[PDB]
Ligand binder design. Structure first.
Ligand SMILES: *[C@@H]1O[C@H](CO)[C@@H](O[C@@H]2O[C@H](CO)[C@@H](O[C@@H]3O[C@H](CO[C@H]4O[C@H](CO)[C@@H](O)[C@H](O)[C@@H]4O)[C@@H](O)[C@H](O[C@H]4O[C@H](CO)[C@@H](O)[C@H](O)[C@@H]4O)[C@@H]3O)[C@H](O)[C@H]2NC(C)=O)[C@H](O)[C@H]1NC(C)=O
Ligand SMILES: *[C@@H]1O[C@H](CO)[C@@H](O[C@@H]2O[C@H](CO)[C@@H](O[C@@H]3O[C@H](CO[C@H]4O[C@H](CO)[C@@H](O)[C@H](O)[C@@H]4O)[C@@H](O)[C@H](O[C@H]4O[C@H](CO)[C@@H](O)[C@H](O)[C@@H]4O)[C@@H]3O)[C@H](O)[C@H]2NC(C)=O)[C@H](O)[C@H]1NC(C)=O
Lengths: 200, 200
């Protein structure tokens, strides 16, 4: 196939999205977000055609179906792999979504490892480096979270590290209570705190 | 500081390594291995100077000190976060080291997430794309493993996903018994099984 069959044409207003269906993500990808590793290139459809991808990962209303037990990798017995762990100061976490949510992830994992639909890659044309709903935080006070591997989903390899913060509070609470600190991702790309190899 | 003080000069034979000390990794890094994400550049010393890095992560003999409980992230109670999970067919795992070991990792995690010393980045000049001890496997038969997040170590963010295969066998056993399949990483960089965005 490899066609726009089965998608939803949003019209000229959705001209910046694949098949004009914002569910399938933008035509032009974020400029500085790592989408995958070199050994396994990113594919927004998980190697499937759009209709096969929609058939597999959407419901009758066309809304994405999301992994069970909060997206943690489930053990052999069907129970999520996780555990209460402390995030050390200086750890960098990120999130796709509003601060009223309670799930952060290890920032260094490529997008293919977060097992998130391609819609989240929609990017503000004014600040095109990272998606519009993308935020980066640095823990400034040790925060215990229930952390675990991300289950593969949406045709993505997954297996990144996610952290539920709801035992303490949502991301907004963590900022207000000095647990987390908002960072500028376009400014972090230029960061280099250490000895560069050129000094040797 | 930012000097070669405290390192071990290997001489002209170690001319391709930082401070001529192969413990600190090669001067020229692998050409196709993702070392970090854009938001958190890789630093072989974890933001420290070589002597501080050696002081923190080596013992009296100069050998690297390695994380406890097989490098899994430890919970609040000091117990490793892991669990028995099945690796689905098509999953890509990698390893730094010989096939007689029993630890694979999610291949898509950048090197900063594996919490491994910079020595493993030494690269064969004949095949410079990936380190010399780097192997990539694709599971061809569902393999249950005890998988978990990687604990930060060696000044690296860690938090990648590692998988102990020893309940079934070492990587050599997995190949012999058709659980895993050896892959060519320089050949996987050119792989693209799916619909490219240019078709839309
Ligand atoms: C980290 O991973 C762990 C391990 O899986 C998850 O823990 C599970 O959490 C869910 C939600 O709290 C638990 O499901 C609930 O269990 C109740 C009974 O629990 C006892 O019995 C079971 C027997 O299987 C034991 O495993 C368990 O330890 C307790 O002894 C039920 O009463 C609940 O039913 C209600 O909620 C469900 C929601 O699914 C509704 O469908 C029902 O109608 C009803 O309203 C519920 O099923 C589950 O038992 C926990 N598992 C284990 C092994 O303890 C964590 O949630 C996870 N953490 C994060 C952040 O994802
Ligand atoms: C995945 O993560 C789990 C959770 O931590 C790890 O399980 C631990 O594994 C180690 C090694 O097998 C266990 O340590 C051993 O425990 C023995 C007693 O176990 C009972 O009592 C403890 C009380 O704390 C309970 O936690 C446990 O469930 C049992 O009821 C000791 O006899 C052993 O001592 C011997 O070995 C140690 C090695 O450290 C030597 O220092 C000693 O001298 C002695 O020779 C040993 O301590 C540990 O108890 C397990 N933890 C839990 C919570 O069960 C898995 O290992 C990990 N998987 C991987 C692949 O990393």
């Amino acid at each position: 196939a490899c066609d726009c069959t089965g998608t939803r044409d949003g019209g000229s207003s959705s001209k910046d999205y694949i098949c004009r269906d914002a569910r399938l993500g933008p035509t032009k990808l974020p400029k500085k977000l790592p989408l995958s590793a070199t050994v396994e290139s990113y594919n927004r459809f998980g190697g499937l055609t759009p209709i096969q991808f929609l058939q597999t990962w959407t419901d009758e209303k066309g809304n994405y179906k999301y992994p069970p037990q909060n997206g943690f990798q489930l053990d052999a017995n069907g129970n999520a792999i996780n555990g209460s762990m402390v995030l050390q100061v200086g750890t960098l976490v990120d999130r796709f979504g509003s601060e009223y949510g309670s799930y952060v992830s290890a920032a260094s994992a490529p997008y293919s490892q977060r097992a998130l639909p391609p819609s989240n890659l929609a990017t503000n044309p004014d600040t095109p480096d990272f998606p519009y709903n993308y935020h980066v935080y640095r823990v400034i006070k040790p925060l215990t979270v229930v952390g675990g591997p991300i289950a593969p989903w949406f045709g993505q390899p997954g297996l990144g590290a996610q952290f539920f913060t709801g035992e303490t509070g949502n991301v907004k609470f963590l900022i207000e209570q000095n647990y987390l600190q908002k960072e500028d991702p376009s400014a972090l790309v230029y960061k280099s705190d250490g000895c560069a190899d050129v000094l040797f």
